Amino acid sequence: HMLSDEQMQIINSLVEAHHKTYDDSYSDFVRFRPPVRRLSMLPHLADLVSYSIQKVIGFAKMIPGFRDLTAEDQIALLKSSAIEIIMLRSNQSFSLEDMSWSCGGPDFKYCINDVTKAGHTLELLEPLVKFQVGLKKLKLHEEEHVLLMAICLLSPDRPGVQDHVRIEALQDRLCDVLQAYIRIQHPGGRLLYAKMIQKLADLRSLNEEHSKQYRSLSFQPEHSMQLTPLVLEVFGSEV
Amino acid sequence: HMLSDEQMQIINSLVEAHHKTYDDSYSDFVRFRPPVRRLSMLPHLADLVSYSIQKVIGFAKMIPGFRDLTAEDQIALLKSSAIEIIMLRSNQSFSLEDMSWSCGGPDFKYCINDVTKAGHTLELLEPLVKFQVGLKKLKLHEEEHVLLMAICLLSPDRPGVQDHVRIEALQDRLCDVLQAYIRIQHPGGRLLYAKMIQKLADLRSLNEEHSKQYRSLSFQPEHSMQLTPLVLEVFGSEV
């Protein structure tokens, strides 16, 4: 009925890491290519994703145990889960009132038709919105939110990983922390952990849909030239 | 003492091509990553060069005879001369009064210390400025300016070209047009053609200095990630 010292330190490290890598003011966005509303929004969103990947990488290197993995496994986990971590962390900006990502005034408020001007269709954009709504309804504590990101990144079931035994070992330790935290520090969360694991499976399908929409983008040189070097390297298949 | 019909058509095509690929208002620059004044200006200048490369490519495809070359020779000529054409066309924006490239108000006025915040040193920046001043003093007509760009691009002496015989053939035809135009349409230009050929040799040395400064940039991944896909492809050596 009480969190251990080690489980607390793991929680302290993740919350600090997330605070070190997420700006609730979104003030770096003026540094991106400005949004325009023929894939009109692609340059801005590419800069947005490239920026978030650097933040996910910063967050990952502070997950306990991650830096002990080989550089190969770190890359393997980063490449496969990068888009899933981005969809998870974007929930902090998602607003239920306007059903969009409100990162600013008119410019940085990202609604559905804006992602359309980036190679995606209204139809395939549907499960992303539903995922964000259901995730928003869980009203996760920062600890639960940050623990879910770390668990997602440390999935042993990624194409590329080698020491899946030890990545699974690290992920289960984090899953133990989340279960304990929910049980002893979240009132009325009797089914929350199960629901969070459900969102992870949803991210897998959203990940696969992005994978295919991205192969279209990266195969058209006039669109892939709009991407950034980091995006092409993280979402490329040149392992 | 009179321009031929063919020499006029070659002049008409180049002036139209340059007018189709150079904006004297520089209004697309708000679409670049904004300038900031640790290689602070690099993202803006990278977007600037990437944009100019697309314009040089557009200009090149309208040079008479260029489209008849193989795609290999076109790439070979583009990759070797891209930075030289950029330095030539930038002279239209270079102002002698402030010794800078005045493409806007405070933001898009590019002085010496701004290029320093892009991996270049004050010392190596010297021949670029002297080149621009001497080029500005020639007071070239648009025809002479646009003819010099086409002659530069069609140099048979580039690493990579194959049918150097026919690229040399195209370049000499353009050199004939420039000599004839200067002789019959430019008063007091008795030595202008010789001076323009001198500027071409100067571009070769500026090109080699950029080549080495760029290898430094492209070998540091934290800097090369700031570049664009087009820049890395044009200035890369993966032929």
Partner: peptide, 10 residues
């Protein structure tokens, strides 16, 4: 390759 990722991972 993965030069950027190797660099960003310190």
């Amino acid at each position: 390759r993965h030069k950027i990722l190797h660099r960003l991972l310190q």
